[PDB]
């Protein structure tokens, strides 16, 4: 089997991407944030505290003839941005782009933190990291990809995120029309539960490539590119007037600037992020200070190849017995 679904930016900055997902019988379609940095499929629901729902579409398990309470199971997750959610668990039929999994754990939120409530466009998350990170207790549950894998034509999914435009998540096949050149594959460590890999270096604009190992994660659920402070300083030093602002929370730059590109290495191959992809717009409405799309990871503990980086590439998440990642230009 295969599946193919369009993913759409939630706003004009590409802060996140939403993908329609069919849950239950008859189908209830919710727009989920596909997150290769986590491993829980959770939704706003008829069980979510009413004051914490503000415009999201909810899953109502009582209206699904295939929903079953997973008795005794609870979940609770905290994300790198400080947001969180928790609740109980049903199993139900879940379909993405024509690919159907029966018995998928659908984690129903009883509580969500304010950032989720405040984002009316995201109805939940669909985790695509390794199932060892799934938070369901006392019986850990499998991701949608893990449940689908054996049925897929090939044990892979691909992320093709757009810049200021829709893109595609495919399951079970690699669309050879969706990229240019060849796909370069690179090793993955699953020891932390992430799609963790080592970039071979970077360049700023037309500058020379610096060969240096940068361990990080391919994370579709993180907006920006978070890299070591040395790398980030080298980038922003090429932008007149750019500075790190403790009050804003990262590097800012004059909105009048033209940003240089940023290149990252994948083995001997190179992915070029155009400068425009690094512009996240005014820090507040009407400001002439703009927020940068490349930020330091120093306070995170891990480097994160988020959407800024991934949207410059066609990305293969290869879930073979030994997982690997593939990157191609497009």
Q: Which of 250, 69, 35 is nearest to 144 (CA)?
A: 35
The answer to whether residues 97 and 171 touch, using CB atoms and an 8 Å cutoff, is yes
The data reach a resolution, in angstroms, of 1.1
Give the integer Cα–Cα distance in Å for 187 and 322. 9
Angstrom distance (rounded) from CA 258 to CA 244: 18
- Torsion region of 21: left, alpha or beta (phi above 0 gives left; psi -120 to 50 gives alpha): beta
* Closest C-alpha among 51, 55, 10, 317 to residue 169: 317
Please check whether residue 157 is in contact with residue 168, taking contact to mean a CB–CB distance below 8 angstroms.
Answer: no
Catalytic residue IDs: 35, 199
CA 235 to chain centre: 23
* CA nearest to 314, candidates 304, 327, 305, 324: 327
Cα–Cα separations (whole angstroms), residue 175 to 154, 155, 281, 327: 12, 14, 33, 13
Nearest-angstrom CA–CA distance, 159 and 182 = 16
**Contact by Cβ (8 Å): 110, 17:** no
Select 5-174's CATH number: 2.40.70.10, 2.60.40.10, 2.160.10.10, 3.60.15.10. 2.40.70.10
- Cβ atoms of residues 199 and 304 within 8 Å: no
**Close Cβ partners of 17 (under 8 Å, ≥ 6 residues apart):** 7, 8, 9, 10, 33, 34, 161, 167, 220, 307
HEC string of the chain?
A: CCEEEEEEECCCCCCCEEEEEEECCCCEEEEEEEECCCCCEEECECCCCHHHCCCCCCECHHHCCCCEEEEEEEEEEECCCCCEEEEEEEEEEEEECCEEEEEEEEEEEEEECHHHHCCCCCCEEEECCCHHHCCCECCCCCCHHHHHHHHCCCCEEEEECCCCCCEEEEECCCCCCCCCCCCEEEECECCCCCCEEEEEEEEECCCCCEEEEEEEEECCCCCCEEECHHHHHHHHCCCCCCEEECCCCEEEEECCCCCCCEEEEECCEEEEECHHHHEEEECCCCCCEEEECEEECCCCCCEEECHHHHCCCEEEEECCCCCEEEEECC
Residue 75 buriedness (CB in 10 A; 0-12 / 13-18 / 19+): buried
- Count the Cβ atoms, other than its own, within 10 Å of residue 191: 9
Comparing C-alpha atoms, which of 196, 222, 198, 194 is closest to residue 212?
198
Spatial distance between the Cα atoms of 172 and 4, rounded to a whole number of angstroms: 9
Rounded Cα distance, 94 and 71, in Å: 19
Kindly report the CATH number that applies to the domain delimited by 175-330: 2.40.70.10
List the domain boundaries for the chain: 5-174, 175-330
> Can 5-174 and 175-330 be said to share one CATH topology?
yes
Breaks (C-N over 2.5 A) in the chain follow: none
In a 13 Å sphere around the CA of 245, the CA atoms on its Cβ side amount to: 14
- Please give the Cα distance from 281 to 79 (Å, whole number): 24
Q: Using alpha carbons, list the distances in angstroms from residue 222 to 79, 313, 328.
A: 10, 15, 20
User: Contacts from 148-151 at CB under 8 Å and sequence distance 24+?
Assistant: 148/1, 148/3, 148/99, 148/101, 148/172, 149/319, 151/1
C-alpha separations of 133 from 39, 155, 273 in Å: 6, 19, 30
Sheet holding 243-245, edge to edge: 243-245, 250-254, 289-292, 279-282
Instruction: Give the β-pairing of 262-266 and 196-204.
Output: antiparallel
The CA-CA-CA angle for residues 123, 167, 105, to 5°, reads 40
Nearest to 227 by CA among 211, 216, 236, 212: 216
Experimental method: X-ray
CA distances from 42 to 24, 31, 64, 133, 284 (A): 14, 11, 16, 14, 31
Phi, psi of 302 (to 5 degrees): -155, 145
Report the distance separating Cα 128 and Cα 41, nearest Å.
Answer: 9
- Which candidate, 309, 284, 311, 282, places its Cα nearest to that of 295? 309
* Residue 330 CA: distances (Å) to CA of 72, 76, 161, 272, 310: 46, 37, 11, 10, 11
Q: How far apart are CA 155 and CA 278, in angstroms?
A: 32
CB atoms closer than 10 angstroms to residue 171: 27
Which residues fall within 8 angstroms of residue 322, CB to CB, at 6 or more apart? none
Distance in angstroms (rounded) separating the CA atoms of residues 34 and 224: 15
């Amino acid at each position: 089997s295969t599946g193919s679904a369009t993913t759409t930016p939630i706003d004009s900055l590409d802060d996140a991407y939403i993908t329609p997902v069919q849950i239950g019988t008859p189908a209830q379609t919710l727009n989920l944030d596909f997150d290769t940095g986590s491993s829980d499929l959770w939704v706003f629901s008829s069980e979510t505290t009413a004051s914490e729902v503000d415009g999201q579409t909810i899953y109502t398990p009582s209206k699904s003839t295939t929903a079953k309470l997973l008795s005794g199971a609870t979940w609770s997750i905290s994300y790198g941005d400080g947001s969180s959610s928790s609740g109980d668990v049903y199993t139900d039929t879940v379909s993405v782009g024509g690919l159907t999994v029966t018995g998928q754990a659908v984690e129903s939120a009883k509580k969500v933190s304010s950032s989720f409530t405040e984002d009316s466009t995201i109805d939940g998350l669909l985790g695509l990291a390794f199932s060892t990170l799934n938070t369901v207790s006392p019986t850990q549950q499998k991701t949608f990809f893990d449940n689908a894998k054996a049925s897929l034509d090939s044990p892979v999914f691909t992320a093709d995120l757009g810049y200021h435009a829709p893109g595609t998540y495919n399951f079970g096949f690699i669309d050879t029309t969706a990229y240019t050149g060849s796909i370069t594959y690179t090793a993955v460590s699953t020891k932390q539960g992430f799609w963790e890999w080592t970039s071979t270096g970077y360049a700023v604009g037309s500058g020379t490539f610096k060969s240096t190992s940068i361990d990080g994660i391919a994370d579709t659920g993180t907006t920006l590119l978070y890299l070591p402070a040395t790398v980030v300083s080298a980038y922003w030093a090429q932008v007149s007037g750019a500075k790190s602002s403790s009050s804003v929370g990262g590097y800012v730059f004059p909105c009048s600037a033209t940003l240089p590109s940023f290149t990252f290495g994948v083995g001997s191959a190179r992915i070029v992020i155009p400068g425009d992809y690094i512009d996240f717009g005014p820090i507040s409405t009407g400001s002439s200070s703009c927020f940068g799309g490349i930020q330091s990871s120093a306070g995170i503990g891990i480097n994160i190849f988020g959407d800024v980086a991934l949207k410059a590439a066609f990305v293969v998440f290869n879930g073979a017995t030994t997982p690997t990642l593939g990157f191609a230009s497009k």
